[PDB]
C-alpha cells in the first residue's frame, strides 16, 4: 500500500519521545517534511540529528501563550499528529485542582490550539488535510486512579468528532487512535509490576501490549489518503480489549 | 413505584433554575432533605419559599477555593445530582483559551470537587449512596459550535464511569443522564432559531425536544434504589436521537 | 413515582419464569391487565393462580405459524415486554447450524413477529404505546462460548433502534435492557461454577450478579411514561460491567 | 506501508460484484492467491479473466450443506474477507419470516460457516491469521426499512468480537469494516433516489458517498500485519456519519 505522505509537511507534537518520536522517525523515512514539537530541548536536539531536515520547536504545549507564538508561524503543514500528553494518576478521592488543570491543558487544550493553527492554514491554501489525535483505550473504559486521564481521553475522542464535523466540508479529516498500554516512559511507569500489568494483559485476547510500531502504523494509515472516508473515528490499537 | 428518597439528604448543584430547580422541587415532594447549590442567591431565595426546609447555598462551583470552603461542613448528604453547567458556544476555529477554561472548570472540575466531598462522608459513615451527573446527548454526538461543550460532556461520561468503578465497592453508584435540547434558559439560547431547531428536530424519532420533567424523572430513577444495578451508564433522554 | 401502568394491557413473553414471571407479577400487582405468554403449560397455570386475571397463552414463540394464530387475535394491547429467549452456548468452532437457527428465531424473530401484532394494533387505534426488549450485557461485550447468544442480543439492540426510528412518529417507544447475570433458570446453568462466576464478578464494580427485581424495575420504568423521552436505548443492568 | 499480503492464500466471499470483486482485484494485484466465491457463475467467469490465477467457487452461501461441501476443499487459506450479504429491504411492520430467514442465513450464518473452516485450518497448521467482516454503518445507526439488514450487521459486529476473543489466543485477528452507502447495484437500489441519497449526504460530514477503493483500502489494511494490534474492531468508512 502506498500511503503517499512523501513531500508532505507534517507536524508532530510530543515528538521528544515514545510514540511521537517513533512517529517522526517513521514519518521521516517516508519522505515527509517533519516539524517536531516537544518540551525538552534536549530531546529535539537528538531528533534533528537523527532525522535531518526536520524543524525542531521547543515549547510547553500546556502554555497557551508560549505555544500560540512558538508555532504561530511554523509555515505550511499538511498533516498533524496531536500526541503530546501528560498522565497524572490519582485515585478519585485524591484528585486535585493542579492535576486536573495541567492534564486538560496539555491533554486537550493544546490539541485545540495547534489544530486551530494547522487547519487555519490548510483552509487558507484551499487544500485538504488530515489530523490524528492520540487518544486511548481508557478513553472508553475507565481504569483506577485515572479519573482525570480517562476524562482527557474521553474528552479527546468527542473533540475529534466535533473537529471532523466542522472541518468536514473543509476536506480536512480528524481521527483518533486508541491503543492499550505502550511500554514507553509512561508505560514503563505504571504497568511495571508483573501482577499489575498481568491483570491488564488477561483482558487482551492477543495477550500482549502494543508497540510503538502498531500505533504508528494506524497513525500513518489515518494520515494517508488510503482512509479518505474515515473521519471522526476511534481506531483501537489495544489487542481487542474493548471487545470483551 | 416507590423511589424512597424521602428523609434523604440530597445535594443538587445548579439548583437555581431549569432542570436544577425542577429537580429540587420534585425532590422536595418526595420528602427528601435538599441542599440546593447555585450561583445566584436570588434563585435560592424563591425556591425556599416554595420548598421550605431546603438549605440554600451560594457559591461559584467554578471556584475550587470558594467551593472547598462553602461546602466543608454541608453535613452528611446521601444523594448527589451534579447539574450546574455553562454552555460556551464558539465555532471550532474561534475557540478561546478562557472559553475552554471556564467550561471545563464548571462542567467537570466542580463535579469532582463536590462528588469528592459527598463521597468521603458516604465512605466515612460506611453507607451506600448514589450520584447523578447531567451529561448530554452531544457527549457522544458532535454538533456545530460545540467543540468545548461536547468535550466537557464527553469528559463527564468517562468521568462517571471511573467514579462508578472506583466508588463501586463502597456501595455508591454513579450514573449520567444525556438529554436532548431542553427549553430552559440554556435551551432558549441556541435553539431559539426555528431553522436551527428544525434540523435538530428532524433527527429525533419522537419529533420533539425533552421537557424538564423527563430529565428529572430519569434523575430520580437513577438516584433511587429502583436502579440499584445500574452504574457508570448514560441514560439518554434525547427522543431516539442516538438510535439513528 | 407513579408510572401509570395500571389499567393498561401488557403482553409479556417468556412469562413462565425468571425476568418474565417477576415482570408479570410486578405488573399484575400494579393494576395492569396482563397476557402472559410462555412455553411450559404448568408454568402458565401457577402464574394465573399467582395473579388471577392474567390471560395465559401457551405457545412456542420460535414457531412463526403457531405464534401467528395463537396471538394474531389477542386484541388491543398497550405495552409489550419481549423477554422470551434461549441460550445455546457453543465454542465458535463448535457452533451448529441448528443452534444458530433455533437461537435466532426465538431470541429475535419472534420479537419482530409479536412487536408487529401489537404495534399494528396501536397504530390502527391511533394511540401511543411502548415496547421493552430484554437484551443482555453480552450484547456489547464478547463472552466465551456465547458466539450466537451475544449475536442475537447484538441484533436485539439494533432492531430496537430501527423499531424506535420507525415507530417513533406513531408515539410508540422501543428500548432494551442489558442486565448482567441473573441467577435464574438461565443464569444458574453456566455460572454455577464458582470460578466461572468470580471471573465475571470481578469485572463488576458493584461486585454482585443482578436480580429479577433489578431488571423488572428497569422494564417497568421504560414501559412507563416516566421515560416518555427515552427511546432506542439500551439500559445497562450489569452493575458497571460495560464501564470498565 | 508494506502490507505484505503477497503470496498468501486469501478467500473472498461475494467476489462476484461490488466490494467483493474490487477486493479480489486489489488482493490479486498485490500478488496474493485469492479464492473467489460468489453465487452467479457468470461473475466469476469474467473476474477470472480479469484476475488470472484466482480460484472461483460458484455457490449459494445461504446453504449450509452446499457450502460445507463446496468449501471443505478450499486449501490452506490464510486470510478471509466475509463480504457476501443480501439487502432485503422491508418496513418493520411489513417484514416477513422469509426475508428474515434468508438475510440472516447469508449475511451471518455463512460468515460463521466459512470462518470456522478457515480458522480450523489455520489452527491445525499452528499458524496466525486474519479475518475481515464487511459490516455496515447502519450496524450502529438505524435507517428506515432496514430492520432486518441493520440487525444482521448489528449481530455481525458482535460476532466479530466473540470471534476476536476466542480466536485471539490463536494468533488469529478478526475485525469488521463499516462503510456507508456504496454506489453498487445494491446501494443503487434504495439510494438511487436523488432525494433519498441527499438526506444521507447531509449527515456525512465529508459530504460524499463512498467508493469501493475506500472500503477495500480498509479491508486490506486490517488483513495486513500493519494492524496486528487491532482486533474485534469495527473500522468505519462512512465519511463521519457516526460522529454526528
Ligand atoms: N505510553 C503508553 O503506555 C500509552 C498508552 C496509551 C496511550 N498513550 C498516549 O500516547 C501519547 C504519547 O504517549 P507516549 O508513550 O509517547 O509518552 P512519552 O514517552 O512520555 O512521550 C510523550 C511526549 O510528549 C511530550 N510532551 C508532554 N507534554 C508536553 C507539553 N506540555 N509540551 C510539549 N511536549 C510535551 C513529552 O516531552 P517531555 O518528555 O519533554 O515532557 C514526550 O516527548 C499520549 O497522548 C498518551 O496519552 C500512551
Ligand atoms: N439546557 C438544555 O437544553 C440542556 C440540555 C442537555 C443537557 N443540559 C445540562 O443539564 C444541566 C442543567 O442545565 P439547564 O438547562 O437546567 O441550565 P440553566 O437553565 O442554565 O440552569 C443551570 C443552573 O446551573 C447554575 N450554574 C451554572 N454555572 C454555574 C457555576 N459556575 N456555579 C454555580 N452555579 C452555576 C445556574 O445558576 P446561575 O444562573 O445563578 O449561574 C443555573 O441555575 C447542565 O449540566 C446542562 O449542561 C441542559
Ligand atoms: N438469567 C440470565 O443470567 C440473563 C442475563 C441477562 C439477560 N437475560 C435475558 O433475559 C431473558 C430471559 O432470561 P431468564 O433468566 O428469565 O430465563 P429462564 O429462567 O430460562 O426463563 C425464560 C422464559 O422464557 C420462556 N421461553 C423460552 N423459549 C420460549 C419459546 N420459544 N416460546 C415461548 N416461551 C419461551 C421459558 O419457558 P420454557 O422454559 O417453558 O421454555 C422461560 O419461562 C432473555 O432475553 C435472556 O436472554 C438473562
Ligand atoms: N451496496 C451498498 O451500497 C453497500 C453499502 C454499505 C454496505 N454494503 C455491504 O458491502 C458488502 C457487499 O455489498 P455490495 O455493495 O458489494 O453488493 P452487491 O453489488 O450486491 O454485491 C454483493 C455480492 O455478494 C454476492 N452474494 C450475495 N449473496 C450471496 C450468496 N448467498 N452466495 C454467494 N454469493 C452471494 C453477490 O452475488 P450475486 O448477486 O451475483 O449472487 C454479489 O456479487 C456487504 O456485506 C453489504 O452488506 C453495501
Tab-separated table of C-alpha atoms in Angstrom, chain C residues 124-235:
chain	number	residue	atom	x	y	z
C	124	UNK	CA	-54.502	1.399	13.751
C	125	UNK	CA	-56.045	2.591	17.020
C	126	UNK	CA	-54.136	5.858	16.713
C	127	UNK	CA	-52.907	5.512	20.284
C	128	UNK	CA	-49.446	5.696	21.840
C	129	UNK	CA	-47.743	2.648	23.329
C	130	UNK	CA	-44.322	1.366	24.370
C	131	UNK	CA	-42.165	-1.737	23.953
C	132	UNK	CA	-39.378	-3.209	26.095
C	133	UNK	CA	-36.831	-5.650	24.674
C	134	UNK	CA	-34.763	-7.649	27.162
C	135	UNK	CA	-31.312	-7.913	25.656
C	136	UNK	CA	-28.153	-8.539	27.647
C	137	UNK	CA	-24.804	-7.302	28.890
C	138	UNK	CA	-23.082	-9.565	26.375
C	139	UNK	CA	-24.879	-7.733	23.594
C	140	UNK	CA	-21.976	-5.261	23.659
C	141	UNK	CA	-19.097	-7.347	25.058
C	142	UNK	CA	-17.981	-10.758	23.814
C	143	UNK	CA	-18.226	-13.702	26.173
C	144	UNK	CA	-16.679	-17.109	25.560
C	145	UNK	CA	-18.899	-19.820	24.122
C	146	UNK	CA	-21.591	-17.192	23.568
C	147	UNK	CA	-20.878	-16.630	19.885
C	148	UNK	CA	-24.545	-16.929	18.887
C	149	UNK	CA	-26.263	-15.671	22.047
C	150	UNK	CA	-24.431	-12.325	22.125
C	151	UNK	CA	-25.071	-12.034	18.360
C	152	UNK	CA	-28.832	-12.402	18.859
C	153	UNK	CA	-28.577	-9.813	21.632
C	154	UNK	CA	-26.318	-7.713	19.427
C	155	UNK	CA	-29.010	-7.925	16.772
C	156	UNK	CA	-31.563	-7.239	19.504
C	157	UNK	CA	-30.022	-3.849	20.319
C	158	UNK	CA	-30.096	-2.624	16.724
C	159	UNK	CA	-33.591	-3.917	15.990
C	160	UNK	CA	-34.757	-1.832	18.914
C	161	UNK	CA	-33.193	1.236	17.309
C	162	UNK	CA	-34.731	0.545	13.916
C	163	UNK	CA	-38.076	-0.181	15.596
C	164	UNK	CA	-37.645	3.040	17.552
C	165	UNK	CA	-36.944	5.094	14.440
C	166	UNK	CA	-39.846	3.655	12.505
C	167	UNK	CA	-42.487	3.608	15.240
C	168	UNK	CA	-41.353	6.945	16.702
C	169	UNK	CA	-43.833	9.151	14.851
C	170	UNK	CA	-46.563	6.684	15.926
C	171	UNK	CA	-45.912	7.627	19.546
C	172	UNK	CA	-44.512	4.214	20.334
C	173	UNK	CA	-41.191	3.840	22.115
C	174	UNK	CA	-38.746	0.912	21.961
C	175	UNK	CA	-35.913	0.279	24.393
C	176	UNK	CA	-33.784	-2.588	25.586
C	177	UNK	CA	-32.451	-3.757	28.943
C	178	UNK	CA	-28.993	-5.280	29.230
C	179	UNK	CA	-28.623	-6.978	32.613
C	180	UNK	CA	-25.571	-8.904	33.747
C	181	UNK	CA	-26.001	-12.465	35.021
C	182	UNK	CA	-29.241	-13.268	36.817
C	183	UNK	CA	-29.092	-16.470	38.860
C	184	UNK	CA	-32.353	-17.698	37.357
C	185	UNK	CA	-33.017	-20.777	35.250
C	186	UNK	CA	-30.709	-19.389	32.554
C	187	UNK	CA	-28.165	-17.903	34.969
C	188	UNK	CA	-27.720	-20.783	37.413
C	189	UNK	CA	-26.657	-23.010	34.496
C	190	UNK	CA	-23.256	-21.999	33.128
C	191	UNK	CA	-22.166	-19.748	36.005
C	192	UNK	CA	-22.828	-22.207	38.815
C	193	UNK	CA	-19.069	-22.849	38.680
C	194	UNK	CA	-17.670	-20.648	41.461
C	195	UNK	CA	-14.556	-19.954	39.402
C	196	UNK	CA	-16.637	-19.103	36.339
C	197	UNK	CA	-18.596	-16.609	38.430
C	198	UNK	CA	-15.727	-14.825	40.153
C	199	UNK	CA	-14.208	-14.287	36.712
C	200	UNK	CA	-17.307	-12.239	35.946
C	201	UNK	CA	-17.990	-10.861	39.433
C	202	UNK	CA	-14.514	-9.317	39.395
C	203	UNK	CA	-15.371	-7.250	36.328
C	204	UNK	CA	-18.406	-5.816	38.103
C	205	UNK	CA	-17.781	-2.639	40.113
C	206	UNK	CA	-20.860	-3.474	42.195
C	207	UNK	CA	-19.439	-6.937	42.796
C	208	UNK	CA	-22.730	-8.816	42.531
C	209	UNK	CA	-24.886	-10.536	39.907
C	210	UNK	CA	-28.239	-8.982	39.035
C	211	UNK	CA	-31.638	-9.956	40.482
C	212	UNK	CA	-35.029	-10.222	38.771
C	213	UNK	CA	-36.335	-7.182	40.630
C	214	UNK	CA	-33.499	-5.099	39.165
C	215	UNK	CA	-34.469	-5.714	35.536
C	216	UNK	CA	-38.198	-5.622	36.320
C	217	UNK	CA	-37.580	-2.203	37.801
C	218	UNK	CA	-35.782	-1.221	34.575
C	219	UNK	CA	-38.565	-2.705	32.493
C	220	UNK	CA	-41.429	-1.003	34.318
C	221	UNK	CA	-39.535	2.301	34.257
C	222	UNK	CA	-39.217	2.061	30.490
C	223	UNK	CA	-42.751	0.776	29.944
C	224	UNK	CA	-43.811	3.831	31.931
C	225	UNK	CA	-44.345	7.360	30.628
C	226	UNK	CA	-41.843	8.473	33.262
C	227	UNK	CA	-39.481	7.693	30.396
C	228	UNK	CA	-41.549	9.316	27.646
C	229	UNK	CA	-38.359	10.675	26.080
C	230	UNK	CA	-36.188	7.544	26.275
C	231	UNK	CA	-36.424	5.536	23.027
C	232	UNK	CA	-33.823	3.426	21.242
C	233	UNK	CA	-31.879	2.966	24.459
C	234	UNK	CA	-30.004	0.008	25.898
C	235	UNK	CA	-30.212	0.273	29.660
